Design a protein around this ligand. Sequence first.
Ligand SMILES: [Mg+2]
Ligand SMILES: [Mg+2]
Ligand SMILES: [Mg+2]
Ligand SMILES: [Mg+2]
Ligand SMILES: [Mg+2]
Ligand SMILES: [Mg+2]
Ligand SMILES: [Mg+2]
Ligand SMILES: [Mg+2]
Ligand SMILES: [Mg+2]
Ligand SMILES: [Mg+2]
Ligand SMILES: [Mg+2]
Ligand SMILES: [Mg+2]
Ligand SMILES: [Mg+2]
Ligand SMILES: [Mg+2]
Ligand SMILES: [Mg+2]
Ligand SMILES: [Mg+2]
Ligand SMILES: [Mg+2]
Ligand SMILES: [Mg+2]
Ligand SMILES: [Mg+2]
Ligand SMILES: [Mg+2]
Ligand SMILES: [Mg+2]
Ligand SMILES: [Mg+2]
Ligand SMILES: [Mg+2]
Ligand SMILES: [Mg+2]
Ligand SMILES: [Mg+2]
Ligand SMILES: [Mg+2]
Ligand SMILES: [Mg+2]
Ligand SMILES: [Mg+2]
Ligand SMILES: [Mg+2]
Ligand SMILES: [Mg+2]
Ligand SMILES: [Mg+2]
Ligand SMILES: [Mg+2]
Ligand SMILES: [Mg+2]
Ligand SMILES: [Mg+2]
Ligand SMILES: [Mg+2]
Ligand SMILES: [Mg+2]
Ligand SMILES: [Mg+2]
Ligand SMILES: [Mg+2]
Ligand SMILES: [Zn+2]
Lengths: 63, 202, 102, 157
Amino acid sequence: AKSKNHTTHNQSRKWHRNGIKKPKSQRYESLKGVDPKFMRNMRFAKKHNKKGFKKMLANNAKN
Amino acid sequence: RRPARCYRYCKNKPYPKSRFCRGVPDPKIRIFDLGRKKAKVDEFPLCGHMVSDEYEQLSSEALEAARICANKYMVKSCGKDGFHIRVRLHPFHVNRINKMLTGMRGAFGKPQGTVARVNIGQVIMSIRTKTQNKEHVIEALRRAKFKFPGRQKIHISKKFGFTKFNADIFESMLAEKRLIPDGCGVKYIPNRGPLDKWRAIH
Amino acid sequence: VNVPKTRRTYCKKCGRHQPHKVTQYKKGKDSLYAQGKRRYDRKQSGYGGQTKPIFRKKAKTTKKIVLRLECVDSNCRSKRMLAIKRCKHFELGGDKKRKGQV
Amino acid sequence: TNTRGKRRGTRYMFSRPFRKHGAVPLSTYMRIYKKGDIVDIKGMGTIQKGMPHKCYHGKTGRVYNVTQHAVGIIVNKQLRGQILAKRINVRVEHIRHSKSRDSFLQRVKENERKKKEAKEKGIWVELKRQPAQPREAHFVRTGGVEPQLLEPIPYEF
RNA sequence: UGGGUAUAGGGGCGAAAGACUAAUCGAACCAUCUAGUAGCUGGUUCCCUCCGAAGUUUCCCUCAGGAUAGCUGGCGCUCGUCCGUCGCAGUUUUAUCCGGUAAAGCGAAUGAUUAGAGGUACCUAUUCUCAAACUUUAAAUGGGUAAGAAGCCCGGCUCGCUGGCUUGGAGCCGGGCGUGGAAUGCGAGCACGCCUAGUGGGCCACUUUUGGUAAGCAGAACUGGCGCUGCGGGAUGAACCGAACGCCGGGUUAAGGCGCCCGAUGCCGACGCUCAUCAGACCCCAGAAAAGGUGUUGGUUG
RNA sequence: GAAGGCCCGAGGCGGGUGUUGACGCGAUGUGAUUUCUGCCCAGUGCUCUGAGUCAAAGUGAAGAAAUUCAAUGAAGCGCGGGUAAACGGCAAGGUAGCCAAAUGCCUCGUCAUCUAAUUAGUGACGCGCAUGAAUGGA
RNA sequence: GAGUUUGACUGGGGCGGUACACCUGUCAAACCGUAACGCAGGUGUCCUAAGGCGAGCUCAGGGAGGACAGAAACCUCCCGUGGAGCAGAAGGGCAAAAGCUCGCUUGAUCUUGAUUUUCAGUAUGAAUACAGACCGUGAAAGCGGGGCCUCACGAUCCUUCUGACUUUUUGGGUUUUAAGCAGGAGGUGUCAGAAAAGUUACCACAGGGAUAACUGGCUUGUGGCGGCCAAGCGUUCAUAGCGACGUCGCUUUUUGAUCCUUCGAUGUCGGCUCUUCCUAUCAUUGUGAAGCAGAAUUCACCAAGCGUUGGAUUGUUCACCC
RNA sequence: GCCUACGGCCACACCACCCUGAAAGUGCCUGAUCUCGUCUGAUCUCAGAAGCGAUACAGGGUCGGGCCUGGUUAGUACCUGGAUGGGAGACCGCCUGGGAAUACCAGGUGUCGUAGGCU
Ligand SMILES: [Mg+2]
Ligand SMILES: [Mg+2]
Ligand SMILES: [Mg+2]
Ligand SMILES: [Mg+2]
Ligand SMILES: [Mg+2]
Ligand SMILES: [Mg+2]
Ligand SMILES: [Mg+2]
Ligand SMILES: [Mg+2]
Ligand SMILES: [Mg+2]
Ligand SMILES: [Mg+2]
Ligand SMILES: [Mg+2]
Ligand SMILES: [Mg+2]
Ligand SMILES: [Mg+2]
Ligand SMILES: [Mg+2]
Ligand SMILES: [Mg+2]
Ligand SMILES: [Mg+2]
Ligand SMILES: [Mg+2]
Ligand SMILES: [Mg+2]
Ligand SMILES: [Mg+2]
Ligand SMILES: [Mg+2]
Ligand SMILES: [Mg+2]
Ligand SMILES: [Mg+2]
Ligand SMILES: [Mg+2]
Ligand SMILES: [Mg+2]
Ligand SMILES: [Mg+2]
Ligand SMILES: [Mg+2]
Ligand SMILES: [Mg+2]
Ligand SMILES: [Mg+2]
Ligand SMILES: [Mg+2]
Ligand SMILES: [Mg+2]
Ligand SMILES: [Mg+2]
Ligand SMILES: [Mg+2]
Ligand SMILES: [Mg+2]
Ligand SMILES: [Mg+2]
Ligand SMILES: [Mg+2]
Ligand SMILES: [Mg+2]
Ligand SMILES: [Mg+2]
Ligand SMILES: [Mg+2]
Ligand SMILES: [Zn+2]
C-alpha cells in the first residue's frame, strides 16, 4: 500500500493564487540586531539632543 | 546474453568502469588496430570510414564481430599487410542487468556488458590502404554493417590516411617541412617554437 | 579523553580567574524522602502493579562527563559543574602526551 | 531524501576559482560598508568564518548593522509566497559593493546637475531613460559596388 | 433403555472429537451496565444567487488517521477613486551581480584508454576513444538587487561610541530644489486584518529526468490539464486539438472537415506519385523492423 | 504411614478420595504376547546435602528527634550430589535394529520381481535432506 | 489463574534491510529546493591538545651524492603549487598558512539579547556576528569564549549536583527536613522522546481490490518461433541441407514483472464430455527443391477440407513406454 | 632614465637560459665585544665597511614554455518558445529568438599609488 512521497506540482499555483507579497517598506526600519555599544551611544545622542536646541534656533536665524 | 534490442538506445547517463562501478566484466573487443599498423603515412594514402547515422549504443560484441568481418575480407582481397583497420569506438558505457526474477524491490542491477555510445555522424571503423583498393574497403565496410544495428553509411574521407590533413594539401606541407611522418601519423610543425628545432629539420 | 586535575578558570563568587581543583561528578544516593520519591512509594503501595514506566530500550553507550570544579581559595571554596562531550574512556590524573617516542 | 547539511551541494559554489587560491587580497578588507548600502553576497571558501548560507550566495541586500570585520545584511528570501527580509551576519570577505547601486547614484548626481545646468540656461533637457527606439530613416550608400550575391552552398558529406 | 437423583458457565462433564452442557459451545442462556467504542463501511431530506478547492510542507507507535502550513469562504476595516501623486506586478527594458547544466575539453589537472614514432622497461614528441559521483573553459533558459522627495543640495546641533586633529559614524534641526527622475498594465493597505470549512489516496501530457529488457511500471523537476467541466472536432474515449458555459436571434470563425451515411467542393481545382492474389487512407492512437526488388519514378558519381 | 499424598472450597473443628490405609489411593508415561530397550546429568526440570546474596520484626551506635549507620541475618537463589521407562540430545557423538517406509529433499534412487508396456506394489541396497530403541525399536 | 502488549516503513505480507535521528559526493535538469528499498560512502566517536596564541620551519616525491648501507636506515645538495599533511567518510579550504616543530597556556571559562540552517519559520542539535566580565598569548597590531568548514546528538515528569537569596516549610521563633528559583547531568537510537513475547487451520469483527493468491489488460526479461550477414560444416562446393561471431523481428500455448478491474465472493487443478476456431501442415490433395536413380527421406509452396487412436504407471497437465 | 621602504592589482608580473648594467641605493661581503640564537655566527640577532656587480636586483634577448588578448573553429555544437512537422523508432528539419568551447593563427608581455633618493 505505497503512496506518493514528495510533490511540488500544484504549489506554484497556490503561492501565486494570492500573489507573492513582499513586506511593505516602512521608513525607520527596526533596529534589531545592531551593535549594542552603537545603540548605547545613539540613545545618548537622542537623550541629550535637546541640549543644543537653543543653538539650532540661533543658527537658523542667520539664514 | 540478452539481445541487443534491450541496450540499443542511450537511455541512461554514461556509466563508465570507475571506482563506483566495480565488478564490470572485460569487453569482448580488445584489439582496435589490425593489419600493418607500423606502416608509413605514404603507404596507405586512401582512407575509408564507417560513419554512423543513429544515436545508439554499439555493443562490444558487435564491435568485435564487425572487426573480424572487415579484417577477413581485407586480408582475402588486399593481403595481410596491405591495410590498417582502426576501430574508433571503445566500449566504455557499462550495461546493467536485473536479477533472474521481491520483483522490483532493489532493482538496481549488476554490470552485464559494455557498449560504445556512437553519435550521428561519428566514425565507427576506419580502414586505410592503397588507392586502388578503394572498392575493397567499401565492400569490407559494407559487410561489417550487418554486424551492427541501426543505419550506417560508408564515406571515403578527403584526408590523407589516418591524418587530419586533406590529401590535396598533404603533399605541399611535406615539401615545406611542415609535416614530418612519425610512424602511422604525421606531426604538424608550426613556426612558433625555438629556432633550434627548425635548424634540425633543415 | 584526559583533562588535568588543576584548572585556572573563572570563579563566579570571586569574580575572576582562580586556580580550581578538577574532579569528577558522582550522582550520590537518592534521598528516600524526596517529593517524587515519596509519591512514587505511595502510588506503588497496594494492588495495581507497576504504575510508572520502566525504561528498557537503552541506546546510549557513554555519558557526558561532568567535571566538579572547585576554587582552591580557602575563603571561597565554590564548586561549579562543567560538562564535556561524551567519551568512552575518561581519565583525570593521566599524563601528558609525548610526540617523538616509540 | 537528501541531507540537510549546511554546505550540502556547495562543491563548486564555495570553491575558489582556478589559479585564484591562496591568501585573500587586502583590498577586500579595506572597503567601507556603511549602513544602508547595497552589497552583493558571494561565499569565499578561503575564509570559513562568517560564511553565508548557500541560499544567499548570489543574493543582494542592504546593510543595517556594521561590526568589526563583519556586517549585517537585510536579504530578501522568498520561501513559498512570502518574501522574507532576512537579517544575516556575514564577514566582509563574502560581500562586494553592488555596482548597480553605484551606477544609479551617479545618474542622480548627473540628473541633479543637468536640471540645474538647464535652469541656468533656460533650456529643457531630458532625464528619463527611454528604451531602444525603432531606427529612424536613413540612406544607405552602395559605394558604386553592387551588393555581394549570396546563395546556399551545396551539401558536402 | 425408561424413571428417580448428582455435577452449572472460565463451570460442569468428557474411553479426549475442543466433544458435549435444551437445533446455541475454542467458554451456554437471560436481563442489565449499553444508545459500550470504532482513525472503519453505509446513508444523511427544499429551491435559487455568488465565490470556490486540496491530495503538498513540518510533526505524530502516523503510512485507511490527526495536528500544522498552504489553498477557500465569510466578515469587514484603513484609504485612494478626472488629470497628477502614492501603491502594486507569475511581464519586458536598462544597469549590475550569481551559477558550473547543455555543449566542450582531456596535445590542460584527476581517472580511464588505442596505436605507432624518437631518444636511451621507462622517457620525449604525437595519436585513437571517454566520465554521473572529472575538469582549464562554458551557454540558452533561470535567480537576486537597483531604476529617487524615505531623494538631492546648503547650513547647523546632539553623543557617554570612534579619535593625531568635526577625526569618523549615526541621529536630529532649518532652508532650498519635481522634468515623480525606464516601458506597460493596474486601486491598494491592515504580521495580505479577524474567524474559518473542505482537503492532506490524486492522476495525465510536452519537455527534462531516475530505477527497470520493458510496461496502460515505479519515482522526480516545470508548466498546463483531468479530478471539479459541459461544449465543437479525433467514429468511440476522464487527460489529446480548438474553445470553457445565464436564456435567445442574426452573423463570423476555431480545431476539424466537405463521395454517401453526415451539415459543406454537384470547382469543367493545379502539379505529380502509386496497382498492391495481405493496396493505401493523416496529432494523441490503438501492429511493424533489419534486410531485399531488372515494379515504377527521381537524383547523384563514374 | 493420616499432624499424610491428591483435590475441592469465599469462609469453619469445611469437603472429596475415605464405609479408604501401600495387594491402598493419587499423578503420569508407554500400550497384548514374543524380543530387545544402547550412549549423554552438560542445558532445562525434579530431588537430596550443609558453608556468597538475604525482607519485615528484633538488637546496637550516632543525632534534639525525624532519620541514618552497623551487626545479626529465614526460606529461596547461588554452590555441590543424584536423576534420562524426567523434558531432551546422540555433555554423548546413534549402539541393537529398521528403511527410499504413513518417515528419502534430490527421486520416477539403484537392482530383481511383478506386466506387451508400471512415477504404482513387493523383496532387497542405505553417509538415512531429516530412521532408531517405553519422545519406545523390531 | 487474571489483565494487557507483541513498532513503523515496505513494488502484498513475512524474512532481509533501516532508505526511522544525522553527514559527504551524485542524482538535481548552472540560485535555493526536489523523490524512489536511486548510486558510492560515513556516524552514536576521537582530542589537555588533535583546544588557544606566538615564533621558526616546509611537505609528497624525484635527481645526484656519501663507510658498513642493499630496491627501502641516516647525512648532504638540487628540483619540487602542494602531487604531503590537516583524528575519521567525502567535498571544500589551506605554503614564511589551517601543515611540521617548539614554549607559554586553559576563549573547551562567567553572562544578556539578536541572527543563520533544518523550519510551521516551533523546539532540539549545530552554527554566525556583537556586547558586558575575567583571562590566555604575542614586542605589538591582533587572535581565541573548542577542534579549518560541512556530521558526531535528546522534551515533560523524576532523581542528582552546583549556585543564589528579605524564597516558602501554612498561629509565631529556633534548628533539622521538605519544597521552590537558576544552571548542569542521569534518556528515551521507533533518536519531537508508550512500559511490552508469541500462537491460532478452532478462530472472530470492522473493512480493504489503497493489498496478495485464480482470469483478463500493458510489458516480453525469460520461454517459444522466424529472418538478415556469411566464418565454417557439407570429401572438393558459403547458402541441397545447415549458420559460428553478430544482428533484426514476431508470438502470447512458459515464466516473470506490474497491481488496472473484482475481497456486501467471477467457485479454483486435472480428467471426462462436447462444439467451434487458429496454422507456426504430422498425414492426406496439387506442386517446387535436393548431396531427388528407384524406394525411403529431407526442404519449401497453395492449403486447416479431413483425420490425428487404443493402453501400463502417475491426481497430475507434462513426461515415459507398449 | 634609475634605486630604495611600504604597497594596490596579483604570471602581460611566472620559468629556463643568455647579454648588459652610471650613480646612489640594495645586496653580497668583513667580524662575534655586547644583544640574541644555533650541533656549527651557515641561518638568526648584533658589530662593522677592506673588497666587487660574481650572484642577488634591474633592463634586454629567445621564430622560448606558460600566461594575457584577439581571431578562428562558428552562427558550428547547444538552447527559449511553437506547430495536427517528418520518421516504425532512434532521432532529425523548420519557425521564434539566444548563442559556445579545444585544436589552429596573431599580437602583447607587468602596471599603479605613497614617501625618500640617484642622474
Ligand atoms: Mg500521501
Ligand atoms: Mg519513504
Ligand atoms: Mg503490598
Ligand atoms: Mg545523499
Ligand atoms: Mg436415566
Ligand atoms: Mg457470571
Ligand atoms: Mg484440534
Ligand atoms: Mg455560478
Ligand atoms: Mg491539488
Ligand atoms: Mg475509504
Ligand atoms: Mg484547514
Ligand atoms: Mg488539517
Ligand atoms: Mg484519505
Ligand atoms: Mg508515472
Ligand atoms: Mg501505482
Ligand atoms: Mg475525488
Ligand atoms: Mg479549476
Ligand atoms: Mg481514432
Ligand atoms: Mg449562433
Ligand atoms: Mg466527417
Ligand atoms: Mg532474401
Ligand atoms: Mg516415559
Ligand atoms: Mg541435571
Ligand atoms: Mg544404524
Ligand atoms: Mg495397476
Ligand atoms: Mg520396498
Ligand atoms: Mg532410552
Ligand atoms: Mg487480549
Ligand atoms: Mg506493517
Ligand atoms: Mg540546484
Ligand atoms: Mg568578550
Ligand atoms: Mg487495485
Ligand atoms: Mg527471446
Ligand atoms: Mg546466432
Ligand atoms: Mg502456412
Ligand atoms: Mg484410460
Ligand atoms: Mg611564447
Ligand atoms: Mg581563442
Ligand atoms: Zn573562589
